[PDB]
C-alpha cells in the first residue's frame, strides 16, 4: 500500500503468425516507488492492456533499487552517463529548485522522492533506455560518507547562504589521514562544452528557462 505505480509507455508491438498474420501485443513500461528511495521498473507484455498493466506492476516490485538521496530531496553529486545511445546529465540542485527534467524523469523522481534536480536527455530519447539509464546512474551515486571513508578525510560543505561557515557533512569512520590531498594546479578533467558555453553566456536558447507549472 505504500508503493505507487505510474505508467511510462504503452506500445502496440506486432509479430507475424502463419495462421493469423499480424498478432497485436501490448508492451507496457511502469515504475513503482514508495517515495522514500525504493523504486523499480518493469516491462509487462500481454494481448490485453489490463493484463499487461498487472504483469508489469506486480513484477516491478520484485526489482526495486534503493536510491541514496542527499538530505532526502536531491542527488549527492552531478551524474553524467550514457546508456546505449541515450545521454543523461543530471545536476544537483538546492531546495526549492523543482524537477526541471524530462517528463518521464519527473515521474520517476516523484516515485523515488527526489524533489530538486535538473536533467538534460540527449541522443536517442528511447523511453526504455532513459528509464534503464536513470536507474543505473542514481544507483551508482557515491554518498558523502562513502567518499569520506574512501578518502579518509572530512567532507566540508561550503554554502554561499551561510558565508564561510565550514559544515562537515561526513567524517571518516576509521582513522583520519594527516596528509592533505595533493592539489593539482590544473585539473585534467573532461569538461562538457555545453556547460562551459552556458557559463560564458554564449548559449542563447528561446526554449531554456521558460516559465512552467510547478512540478
Amino acid at each position: 500500500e505504500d508503493f505507487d505505480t505510474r505508467i511510462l509507455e504503452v506500445r502496440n508491438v506486432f509479430t507475424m503468425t502463419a495462421k493469423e498474420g499480424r498478432k497485436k501485443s501490448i508492451r507496457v513500461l511502469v515504475a513503482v516507488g514508495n517515495g522514500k528511495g525504493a523504486a523499480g521498473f518493469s516491462i509487462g507484455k500481454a494481448t490485453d492492456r489490463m493484463d499487461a498493466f498487472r504483469k508489469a506492476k506486480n513484477r516491478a516490485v520484485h526489482h526495486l533499487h534503493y536510491i541514496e538521496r542527499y538530505e532526502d530531496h536531491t542527488i549527492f553529486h552531478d551524474i553524467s552517463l550514457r546508456f546505449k545511445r541515450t545521454h543523461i546529465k543530471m545536476k544537483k540542485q538546492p531546495k526549492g529548485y523543482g524537477l526541471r527534467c524530462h517528463r518521464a524523469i519527473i515521474t520517476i523522481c516523484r516515485l523515488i522522492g527526489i524533489k530538486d534536480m535538473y536533467a538534460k536527455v540527449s541522443g536517442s530519447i528511447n523511453m526504455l533506455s532513459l528509464t534503464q539509464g536513470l536507474f543505473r546512474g542514481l544507483s551508482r551515486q557515491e554518498t558523502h560518507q562513502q567518499l569520506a571513508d574512501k578518502k579518509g578525510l572530512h567532507v566540508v560543505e561550503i554554502r554561499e547562504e551561510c558565508g564561510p561557515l565550514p559544515i562537515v557533512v561526513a567524517s571518516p569512520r576509521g582513522p583520519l589521514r594527516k596528509d592533505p590531498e595533493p592539489e593539482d594546479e590544473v585539473p585534467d578533467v573532461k569538461l562538457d562544452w555545453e556547460d562551459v558555453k552556458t557559463a560564458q553566456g554564449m548559449k542563447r536558447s528561446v526554449w531554456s528557462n521558460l516559465k512552467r507549472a510547478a512540478t
Binding site: 489490463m50 498487472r54 506492476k57
Partner: peptide, 14 residues
C-alpha cells in the same frame, strides 16, 4: 488512480 479491473476468485478453482 486508474483501477485495473481486479480478478475475481480464480475461475478454474481446481
Amino acid at each position: 488512480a486508474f483501477v485495473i479491473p481486479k480478478k475475481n476468485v480464480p475461475t478454474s478453482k481446481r
